[PDB]
Design a protein around this ligand. Structure first.
Ligand SMILES: COC(=O)[C@H](Cc1c[nH]c[nH+]1)NCc1c(COP(=O)(O)O)cnc(C)c1O
Ligand SMILES: COC(=O)[C@H](Cc1c[nH]c[nH+]1)NCc1c(COP(=O)(O)O)cnc(C)c1O
Lengths: 477, 477
């Protein structure tokens, strides 16, 4: 295939390609002008029997791969939430990919587990999380584990919550089947909760009810209390609440200070989904939204959104690691080792067996930037969003139907939804920026997420002017 | 703080480090002499406020990370199954990590989905899988999707199976809770099946029954037929069978030609776990074990074991993609796009939302080696294992209690299990090779897996001699 000295040469060519790509990404159309199925006719119908040349493989990056790529690292990417890479993150995974160890148990590669434990403790401290989420605190029986997505972390929390409650019910009804007991359960989240919460219910067959929110689109204690009472009247057994800090649609925050005490009193697992907004908790001035965090049984966020670690890298912390491990535990002889009892085996904290050395890139990002520069990044992204917000606020054709707390601004043209729909359609023609919509009540809104750590005021104004140009066209039609 | 030009410098340094690391990996002790908790006191208790120097970060690779690493790329790694990296795999993922796009829908990055669809079709053809697993076959309703583990692929298959059966049951019991109907289900696998099958049952609350095997440790049709009939008499509802090709313990193969017809006739989802042995099906001469594959509803194997793609990279194919989508479907406005319904959205084929561009490394590996060289690798690995087998077979103090079909040899000292246990303990002292045990019937066995694509006859002999040294010591104790 390729010799060591050729790897050295091709590695250099790839490093130089990447440097140029990330440095000039603004010049690219963010969304590609392609139709579904475009790639098939451009590739051979079968794998090559003999080696393709590296010149051909490398040449195909621009020739057939890039033409269909959405450039997520563009400052003109404003869709979804950010997913940011960075130089240190790249370098960290280069090492991990080379070692290519697996860390299902402590024994399968001690460093894979121990670096992760220590970095997850660092990161909990950086976020201002409770000490009972630390592996190494005297009062703790919890800890943080990396996962691949918030989706999976939320599912794990639900699985652990329902397994724990089922075990409790089984002590009183040992003759009852676990799946029969599961049928009694009900879980809750905001009607602004991400679709991953619904999906977790569908996968686990746990009834999931989505609760109304206030005028700030925040889930309040009164709504949860009302739901709990109504469901107990119907013979259902409340088991789990997902409270969201930084909702997908408008980046609202559920009222943890109200929801927490209810979950504690009613014995409900309280899981916090902070996928995006968790990174803001690096900055103490944004920690008002974390008030009540002491009531949480679990917490998750994505460094793979806003903290400049490339995907996959999700943080998931639990207060009670034993509850987590009673959900998943298997014990085949071929995975046993001398230190089972003392050592952390992360296979019991996750769905699959295998896991990789994701903590190298996390460690590298935190060390290379340092905390102060990560904080400065959050603050700058937020300032760029505040600038965009001001541009929109000052234009009387537009309205801003939700508050901007961080890097997401939502807005729409005054008038029927079709105007806003047509603006998005117009912008999609040139693909010079990428935006997607959401709904609040019966109003369609455009979401504008500030993404790239390199975004400047020039980038923001450029993108606003394209949006305004599209609005001017649509309003003339 | 790290600047583009500094990335270029450090990228070069990392490439050079990786070249040297992988080239000289035999020199390393494979298993580190460390105790649990070793890392904590070597690291600061908190993240650095200011950027650490890259000299310090690089320096810490050997100083901090490597002393706790199990060297999975060593030819003297013989534990578990292989997990192989390669130069092309590394280079492919470097590109993917820089672009850092997410492919939850076609629109979120078309290339991410289309390269994967086309390469999964390549791979299905390379394995000799039925055409009904191809995306781009006119009559097909199926396709391949990448996953992170076989564990998750097996879980998804069970989730899809139980969902399908529960919907069937709802036709005659429309008011029954899905979770109540789930309680009546039973799924099957060999008693040699990997622990992920058990774990999938635990996660899903589906009853799992592990069936006895023949003298070759193969699950046979008569065992499945007997279990189905007996459980139907008990009022249980058979739903799912996992047939394993290349079992963990001794690399046995279930009798798919017998199990298939039963599953088709009895309406049971048949899922094939070929985690390790799947790569062998690149070579036509090993496809005898694949007889009956036409009856499979799903199939999974790990390129991330033996095919020289670094982890994560699991192939998962299904015959009926809509059954999968029915298990998982959600429809928030913020994930809809202009081609929804016509384009492939892989979020409906998996548990989480986000997914990354894993197909680049897979494409690069397949292209850089070409099919013939991938086949040569499998054959060479098998030849090294055959050599090891002959070394053991020539020594009458040892026995080989199961047949070697591929790169795994199992063996033990004749006599009580304690002899073999004590050989393992002796070898663990120096950690110059890594071995783990399994059980067959009442006998403890040592597993010897050939791993590194660079394994030589000299490496095999070296490792055998260390094992014999241990045996000679133990046999006179
Ligand atoms: C419309 O935007 C989304 O649905 C984003 C997609 C995304 C992923 N990375 C950047 N943007 N999802 C956001 C989201 C999730 C899903 O995260 P994963 O499970 O894929 O890790 C979960 N929770 C919240 C609150 C979100 O906003
Ligand atoms: C004792 O060794 C194992 O359990 C190996 C671990 C491993 C992973 N990569 C190389 N070796 N497991 C193998 C295995 C699995 C689990 O695969 P993942 O879910 O982690 O991807 C599943 N099925 C079979 C038949 C296996 O042998």
């Amino acid at each position: 295939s390729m010799e060591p000295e050729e790897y050295r040469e091709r590695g250099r060519e790839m490093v130089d390609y990447i440097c140029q790509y990330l440095s000039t990404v603004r010049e690219r159309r963010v969304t590609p002008d392609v139709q579904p199925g475009y790639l098939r006719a451009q590739l051979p119908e079968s794998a090559p029997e003999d080696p393709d040349s590296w010149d051909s493989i490398f040449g195909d990056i621009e020739r057939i791969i890039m033409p269909g790529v959405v450039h997520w690292q563009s400052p003109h990417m404003h869709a979804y939430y950010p997913a940011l890479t960075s130089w240190p993150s790249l370098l960290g995974d280069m090492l991990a990919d080379a070692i290519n160890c697996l860390g299902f148990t402590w024994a399968s590669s001690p460093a894979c587990t121990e670096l992760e434990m220590n970095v997850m403790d660092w990161l909990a401290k950086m976020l201002g999380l409770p000490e009972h989420f630390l592996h190494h605190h005297p009062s703790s029986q919890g800890g943080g584990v990396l996962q691949s997505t918030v989706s999976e972390s939320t599912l794990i929390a639900l699985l652990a919550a329902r397994k724990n409650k089922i075990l409790e019910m089984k002590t009183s009804e040992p003759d009852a089947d676990e799946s029969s007991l599961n049928a009694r359960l009900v879980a809750y989240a905001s009607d602004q909760a991400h679709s991953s919460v619904e999906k977790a219910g569908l996968i686990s067959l746990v009834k999931m009810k989505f609760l109304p929110v206030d005028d700030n689109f925040s889930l309040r204690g009164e709504a949860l209390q009302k739901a709990i009472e109504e469901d107990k009247q119907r013979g259902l057994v409340p088991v789990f609440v997902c409270a969201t800090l930084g909702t997908t649609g408008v980046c609202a925050f559920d009222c943890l200070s109200e929801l927490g005490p209810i979950c504690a009193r009613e014995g409900l697992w309280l899981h916090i989904d902070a996928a995006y907004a968790g990174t803001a908790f690096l900055c103490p001035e944004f920690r008002g939204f974390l008030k009540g965090i002491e009531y949480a049984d679990s917490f998750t966020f994505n460094p793979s959104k806003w903290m400049m670690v490339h995907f996959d890298c999700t943080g998931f912390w639990v207060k009670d690691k034993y509850k987590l491990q009673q959900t998943f535990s298997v014990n085949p002889i071929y995975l046993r080792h001398a230190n089972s009892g003392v050592a952390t085996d992360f296979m019991h904290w996750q769905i699959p067996l295998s896991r990789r050395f994701r903590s190298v890139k996390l460690w590298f990002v935190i060390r290379s930037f340092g905390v102060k520069n990560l904080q400065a990044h959050v603050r700058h992204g937020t300032e760029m969003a505040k600038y965009f917000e001001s541009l929109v606020r000052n234009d009387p054709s537009f309205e801003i139907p939700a508050k901007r707390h961080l890097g997401l601004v939502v807005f729409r043209l005054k008038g029927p939804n079709s105007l806003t729909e047509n603006v998005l359609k117009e912008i999609a023609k040139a693909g010079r920026l990428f935006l997607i919509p959401a709904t609040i009540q019966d109003k369609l809104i455009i979401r504008f997420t500030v993404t790239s750590q390199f975004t400047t005021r020039d980038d923001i104004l450029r993108d606003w002017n394209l949006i305004r140009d599209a609005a001017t066209l649509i309003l003339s039609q």
